[PDB]
């Protein structure tokens, strides 16, 4: 009947500092799924499936 939600945070990312000094970064994929280098991600889902970094090789049916 009454909802006084104030300064609420849901799925929040803040204050991130990153440094990546790589001389060689290589990815080789053959028929699959590769997810690499996810940083500072936020989301909110209502009545649904919520993935961030989800890999699936294949779905044979």
Binding site for a second copy (CB under 8 A): 1-61
Q: Measured between alpha carbons, how far is 31 from 1 in angstroms, rounded to an integer?
A: 52
CB of 51 to a second copy, least distance (A): 5
Q: Is 38 known to sit in a ligand binding site?
A: no
42 contacts 11 by C-beta, under 8 angstroms: yes
Max alpha carbon distance in the chain (Å)? 58
CB of 25 to a second copy, least distance (A): 5
């Amino acid at each position: 009947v009454l909802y006084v939600g104030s300064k609420t945070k849901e799925g929040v990312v803040h204050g991130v500092a990153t440094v990546a000094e790589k001389t060689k970064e290589q990815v080789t994929n053959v028929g699959g799924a590769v997810v690499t280098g996810v940083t500072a991600v936020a989301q909110k889902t209502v009545e649904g499936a919520g993935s961030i970094a989800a890999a699936t090789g294949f779905v044979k049916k």
